[model samples]
Target: MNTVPFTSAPIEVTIGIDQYSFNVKENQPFHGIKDIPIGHVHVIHFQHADNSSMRYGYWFDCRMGNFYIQYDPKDGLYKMMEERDGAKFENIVHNFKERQMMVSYPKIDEDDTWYNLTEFVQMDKIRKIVRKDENQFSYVDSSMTTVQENELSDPAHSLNYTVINFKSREAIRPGHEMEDFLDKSYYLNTVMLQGIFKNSSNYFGELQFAFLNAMFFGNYGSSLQWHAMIELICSSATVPKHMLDKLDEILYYQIKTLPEQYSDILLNERVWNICLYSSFQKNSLHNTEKIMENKYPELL
Candidate 1:
């Protein structure tokens, strides 16, 4: 692997599609429904705990005519696999069927060979577990339902205004006012932020930074701050701009590097390049002014 000092710049990425092609405009506003195209390659970005980025680029193959990319993260913990020694290891492999495997990890000394980790894992059990736990989890419930409940119960739940109105009205004496006011205010703000993340988009990638900031500022205690941060980002898209930018950068870097690091065991499998392109178009809207223009010429 070539060692390059990571610099903050827009890395020009090109994803080739047999039928269609689109450029991902950096620092632009995204339109949720726009930019959807068939037979086009798309890039998806995600961030990891080590402050690194991952980008998944998918394109359709003319022969197979299906989108293909590197291994997916859901395929039995890619990071964990990468950290362990390269040998045939015992793991519960999941495809459509559930079974254990003493499988050998493939090594790629080159980049063009795609690794599809999703194909090798113990998938049946993982899918069953994910489906079973989707709505059953409390955090998921809070994110999907509680946002509506809070809004109906209290008019202040909207993101358009400050959440201070949700606080208690009881008056406190002057002597203890400063510390007491700060404490209550701090807790209230935290709850509001949490509600936003849980109920909002699936872009809770920068959740760790939110908690770290709260801890450093002494607004929230250090213990369990990371957990809180994750919960918030998972629930809503209310996180600040600076944090989101860092998250995007981290994900971009990861996708670029992961293939090089785990070249052997990964396969190039593309799933829904069109869907991913739509996701990027929507996500970019917050940063740049380019109105997401879907392929309909009449709308544009």
Candidate 2:
């Protein structure tokens, strides 16, 4: 399990095959994106515009934790295909699609997953600072993948204990939508990817918004070429280290944490001042209040 942290290198992206839905590439990355799923394929330089904001790309979610970029729609017919003929706009981020890929999806959104959407929403801070007791591992085998072969023939089935991944940075995006859900899940180690080599700087424009949050997170106001395909584990590479950083000094963490779509318009006195009482960053009004009393202890 620990050995699968990373390294099989081939992080790629160039999706665009028509139906283009994933909330229409997060509310229009200049309209329509992503179409490279089904049985996946790799190594293919510039697959024809494929449509993106500007084109800087420096995305890392694949366990790098979180750090994305978008924008550079540098439109006008994609800047005249980068000044009349970029050899078909180099297929989609040149250098021959630099192999460092790790794309994962067979149902993480657009709902109707039926069951087991690789659930996510587990933030068991040391089962609650030695407050003791734990156990909440609902199973969800999508035929159990990792290169298939699963009917649970004891080919190494395991999950005894130990857990923590705070999960949530909008659960790191890439085509996600489950009609809003969170009970138990995984992949909050949002699988990695990074692209950027050719003409850089898609976002990061710093300006006077005529109503701009990068015109809704870049690509229309440019600045979205994210890159960090994996190589900087040390210079404080805090891209997604909600990797249980001491449960934020034993719980009282910051960065508010609430984006499951504004948590269903919650605020019944801020949800009873955050569960049972206590949580304005004062931590613990109920961060899963002891796993819902250990998942329903006789409805006590």
Candidate 3:
């Protein structure tokens, strides 16, 4: 076996016949796309079969056509010794049998090579572990679920709507009635409700809601009002420190550049002070628990 450069072994892969061979051993373990021990024997099959059930039975040495018998770490076992594809690592059929080491073909084709089946098994195990860990993040369940409406609308509905409307006031005062803001806003309401139920409540929902509403309905009232509200909500909302730091980086840039370079014709220094001051008024709400309770009785 040591004398032959490329000795092919006749192995029946399924009903089809194929051949492979073994060559000289090396000083160290062969690590191709996957690992193969140094002492492992490469009982090369003459033919390569992709659909073989014993595809993972051995590790292919890319250096040559030879496939080294897979070394099972749990117990001393040489896999892929049998022609049967169904043979497993622990199966008695996979045990080294007579004449399996004997060379069937005198030499192998120069073009013949091997593919990695061991990598496939390794990747499969990795995928299974990841999928198993996905359910561990169950805290996101409440934040993911959508809100359901009821016919018996709570009186807080009118109160919540007022948070968005400045009927009698000179400007929008989100802070004075801050608790009602999330309820008045559609997307924010849902996300906030979900986050609260999941016990991972944050101001992320408010960020999106304020940004979008500022763009869409900004012109409906005072543009400064919408912009100011965004500033207020972003300032007052309870946010992660990392998130706030990143936010300020962008916000500072806009504040410095927008007024001088791309300032809206309507946005002037005269009204900006008022806008900024109004922004200060939009504090985080205190009635969040009651608001959530009324919005989703079923959740509680």
Candidate 4:
């Protein structure tokens, strides 16, 4: 696979959600708002009042696909932030803890590596779509005498009508050892879900309501994040070009534009914090670069 080296040129592109747009100041700090276009190749900084730093940036290329960049803050920013207003950032730290828990889970044995939860979920969703095709159209003709005659003679006159019979595509089935991979994927996501719920109570006061209303609805108000996460885990290395393009479209139209409605939610802040803390903790306990290599090995 071809890889693109990271460059440091300042490139500007339109960034924002549908309807709301802001011109992002390059390397400057922003707390709320959505779809801010930052110049290309420049790191967009997100800083807190306590001098803590976080960054979010993205790169797109034809060959290597799209990549996300998250900036890590050093100089004891984490400890300082926790000391000053730890309660507010409690969820942030909890997310890191959950990530650690996930990473610590035992790797799947080679003999038992044929299953993957991520692939299973994707296949299940596709099957659901296939099932829905049966009712895409309905016949609604009503004239007393004519309807009676038609009902007696024609099958379409009846309420039951089947249009397309869908056969499961063999290609849709996941790759070898998918079930095993899915099991590991589930363990990883369970940790992620824990982090999400831990922060949900403190951050939004009600875990159920927060999940139903904000995180689930705000991010494109769809299942994009869940699908994206699954795709990342299950097919990252061999994702089809078309699928990658579709993911990019979802990111631009859904995930990238979600922070507008609920400014207080601070989705970007949470994401940045999660990445930084996860990286820091991983680096402290294990080989830092190795962890990153596992996720994005082509980077090296």
Question: How are the candidates ranked when ordered by TM-score, highest leading?
Answer: 3, 4, 1, 2
Q: Which ten residues in a row have the lowest lDDT in candidate 3?
A: 137-146
Q: Whose TM-score is greatest here?
A: 3
Q: What is the TM-score of each candidate against the true structure?
A: 0.18, 0.16, 0.21, 0.20
Clashes of each: 44, 39, 11, 23
CA lDDT, every prediction?
0.25, 0.21, 0.27, 0.26
lDDT of 4 by residue, 1-300 (tens): 111121111222223221222443444332222122222111122223332222212112212222222323443211101123544334433443444311121223462111111111121222222232333211111111222223334433221211111111221224534642423333223333234323211211121111222232232211223332423223223333443343333222333333344534423333323332442122221232334334433333
Stretches off by above 4 angstroms in model 1 are: 1-130, 133-192, 195-239, 243-288, 294-300
Q: Write the per-residue lDDT of candidate 3 for residues 1-300, one digit (tens) a residue.
A: 221111122232221111232332322222111222322122222212332222222212223332334433364222332222333412322233222332233333452221111111122222221132322110110011111112113322111111222232322234645543422232223333233322122232222222222222222222333343344334333444554443343333223322232244424443333323333322232232234234333323
User: What TM value does model 3 have?
Assistant: 0.21
Off by over 4 Å in 4: 1-235, 261-300
Task: Give candidates' CA RMSD values in order.
Answer: 20.3, 21.5, 23.7, 24.3
List the candidates ranked by lDDT, beginning with the highest: 3, 4, 1, 2
Error of 4 at 241 (Å): 1.4
* Residue lDDT tens for model 1, 213-285: 2222211221123233322222222445554554444323323333243322221112112212332223633
User: Runs in model 2 with CA error above 4 Å?
Assistant: 1-255, 260-300
